[PDB]
């Protein structure tokens, strides 16, 4: 660990890879927080249980990867990374996000796959992250997805695979940039008609929605195809049916 730090500043390596190095504490990484010049830091597959506020000193980080650790909480300072574009917090033990986490001004890709997160885990300003184009919330404990999801207008990818969702917010229909929507393995029974305003039938687009207790006609339309689903959820009969299901 004392060899990847000394070599990085004299030869000016912008990317640092310390994956699978048995690191349990970033402070034990000799001279790590003096590398203010780095733009990418990979600490995946280690034994971190927390992230120190010293992470704020690495102000030029553009890619930050904490995949597969045991991180239980994050410092507020995590939102001070002005140049941060990619943040991978996948496969950890997070059930909360720090205060003002949504203050990240340049975040494009946020991966929160496989944690212990629900809607209550999100801070009030979480949906200030309007620069996001990819948000992965797969394998979590979301029962209800907040309507403010509609505020992420630049979102192209949204994954809610294997959660505890009983319903989808209609505000998802406001995501005009969406290419991928992953909602398999939930407890969804009906789809909001507003979703019909979107079109995910393209060859470059993705709509996976298996393993859900869909109502019979929706299941039939799925057996027919995605185009048939989107065409069906736009229909008047289905609007009336939806209105009856809500009441």
């Amino acid at each position: 660990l004392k060899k990847l730090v000394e070599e990085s500043r004299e030869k000016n390596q912008p990317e640092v890879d310390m994956s699978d190095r048995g690191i349990s504490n970033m402070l034990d990484v000799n001279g790590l927080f003096t590398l203010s010049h780095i733009t990418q830091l990979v600490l995946s597959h280690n034994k971190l249980t927390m992230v120190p506020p010293n992470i704020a000193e690495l102000k030029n980080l553009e890619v930050l990867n904490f995949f597969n650790n045991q991180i239980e909480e994050l410092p507020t300072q995590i939102s001070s990374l002005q140049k941060l574009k990619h943040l991978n917090l996948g496969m950890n033990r997070l059930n909360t996000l720090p205060r003002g986490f949504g203050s990240l001004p340049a975040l494009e890709v946020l991966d929160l796959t496989y944690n212990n997160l629900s809607e209550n885990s999100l801070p009030g300003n979480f949906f200030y992250l309007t620069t996001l184009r990819a948000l992965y919330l797969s394998d979590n404990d979301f029962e209800i997805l907040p309507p403010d999801i509609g505020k992420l207008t630049k979102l192209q990818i949204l994954s809610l695979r294997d959660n505890d969702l009983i319903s989808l917010p209609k505000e998802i229909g406001e995501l005009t940039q969406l290419k991928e929507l992953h909602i398999q393995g939930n407890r969804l029974t009906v789809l909001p008609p507003e979703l019909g305003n979107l079109d995910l039938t393209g060859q470059k687009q993705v709509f996976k929605a298996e393993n859900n207790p869909w109502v019979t006609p929706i299941a039939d339309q799925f057996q027919l195809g995605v185009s048939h689903v989107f065409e069906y959820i736009r229909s008047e009969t289905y609007k009336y049916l939806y209105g009856r299901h809500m009441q």
């Binding site: 890879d17 990867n65 574009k85 796959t113 184009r133 797969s138 990818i157 695979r161 991928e180 992953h182």
Partner: protein, 130 residues
């Protein structure tokens, strides 16, 4: 003697257009998509051919998933997405990759073999069934 067209391969006598090193008849200097001539309008070179303003935007506007910029070099197409040659890497360890590498699809993201080997057992067992 006189410059010769590179499209129909015949001598010119009148107006000589000059583009991409080769000379061109004005009516024979055309876009590769729509057979419309440029006739003075700006062309857009791409690996040897030229296109009009819109077609080039349509068929060369692949955007890198990593750096979120328009790819100028060779494009790597995988999992309904595109990467730059120097940007394509594992989504879990950021190790550079090629299509000749054996990665797995995870929510339409590339994951290197080693990383997927490091995945939890229940997750992999559930992913088998998907």
């Amino acid at each position: 003697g006189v410059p010769i067209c590179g499209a129909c391969r015949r001598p010119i006598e009148g107006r000589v257009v000059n583009a991409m090193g080769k000379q061109w008849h004005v009516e024979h200097f055309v876009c590769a998509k729509c057979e419309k001539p440029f006739l003075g309008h700006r062309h857009y070179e791409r690996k040897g051919l030229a296109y009009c303003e819109t077609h080039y935007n349509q068929l060369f506007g692949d955007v890198c998933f990593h750096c979120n910029r328009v790819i100028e070099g060779d494009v790597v197409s995988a999992l309904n997405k595109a990467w730059c040659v120097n940007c394509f890497a594992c989504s879990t360890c950021n190790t550079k990759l090629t299509l000749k590498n054996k990665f797995v699809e995870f929510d339409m993201k590339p994951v290197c073999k080693k990383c997927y080997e490091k995945f939890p057992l229940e997750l992999k067992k559930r992913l088998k069934k998907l």
